[PDB]
Amino acid sequence: SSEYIVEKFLGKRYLRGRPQYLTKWEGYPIEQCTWEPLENLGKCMTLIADYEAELFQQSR
């Protein structure tokens, strides 16, 4: 009832010590992105691993 399609991630944070990702949903404006817990992003692992790889480069 509350599942949507992930397009991209737009940020990372820790909330009470736990990793979250700022999640851009396909078919919704960027204004509607939401912070999501990493444990809920299991079906998005290519997106996650690619995003972590992007961050590692950008953070040289």
């Binding site: 509350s2 599942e3 949507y4 399609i5 992930v6 999640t23 949903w25 939401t34 912070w35 999501e36 809920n40 992003l41 299991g42 079906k43 998005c44 290519t46 997106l47």
Partner: peptide, 8 residues
């Protein structure tokens, strides 16, 4: 298609 629950 990569999906996930959305927080509200």
């Amino acid at each position: 298609k990569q999906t996930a629950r959305k927080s509200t």
